[PDB]
Structure 1
């Protein structure tokens, strides 16, 4: 792609420290500040049911792939301006790889 696989273990601790505060990755896990992410890849932005998204996320109609996900994670707000996800971004490529490796695997 324009993405390479990292440590899913490493990625798993990146999440707790960075995503957990607003997210769940488990099938049957609840939405929180952020929506649960089970089954995110191959699915389009704004479709989890029971979640209240911004007009922003919906309209982007992002199709979430490992690659798409990397750019978003760099600067969500730049990528989807008007998004209410308050995360600054994963400046570091190695960080993101790890993370998407993590997601890739547990959102399944």
Structure 2
């Protein structure tokens, strides 16, 4: 259950845990994983110009703060077969902080 946290702390988490694989700016490149602009309020597997695993598309989840928190804890548990699956963001406070940042940065 997402609770708004610190966008400042979330930005640092994004830099150290996500940026190696993702950009978030509008128009940013799909460097490894997809650019994340517009991710909230959108179905999984829909970024224009990115070939996802079929698994990520067929999960058929419409992203919100709560299901993204579950996903980020362990992506392969939520979407079996997802590619380049990172290790997960384990602490609830860290997920809350990251999602607080990502909601802003991705809009």
Deviation at 1:29, TM superposition (A): 0.7
TM value normalised by structure 1: 0.96
Residue number in structure 2 paired with 1:69: 68
Deviation at 1:85, TM superposition (A): 3.5
Deviation at 1:86, TM superposition (A): 2.2
Describe how 1:3-22 pairs up with structure 2 within 5 A: 3-22=2-21
CA contact (8 A) 1:8 1:98 kept: yes
TM value normalised by structure 2: 0.97
Describe how 1:1-108 pairs up with structure 2 within 5 A: 2-108=1-107
Judged with a 3 Å threshold, the aligned counterparts in structure 2 of structure 1 residues 85 and 6 are, in CA distance, closer, same or farther, namely farther
Alpha-carbon distance in 1 for matches of 2:71, 2:85: 12
Alpha-carbon distance in 2 for matches of 1:62, 1:19: 20
Alpha-carbon distance in 2 for matches of 1:106, 1:76: 21
Q: C-alpha root-mean-square deviation of aligned residues, in Å?
A: 0.7
Q: Work out the number of aligned pairs and report it.
A: 107
Runs of 4+ in 1 over 3 A off after TM superposition: none
Deviation at 1:91, TM superposition (A): 1.2
Alpha-carbon distance in 2 for matches of 1:34, 1:40: 13
Superposed CA offset, 1:23-80 (max 9, x none)? 0110111111000000000000011111010010010011010111000011100000
Q: Return 85-94 or 40-49, whichever deviates more.
A: 85-94
Match of 1:17, SS state, is helix
5+ residue gaps, structure 1: none
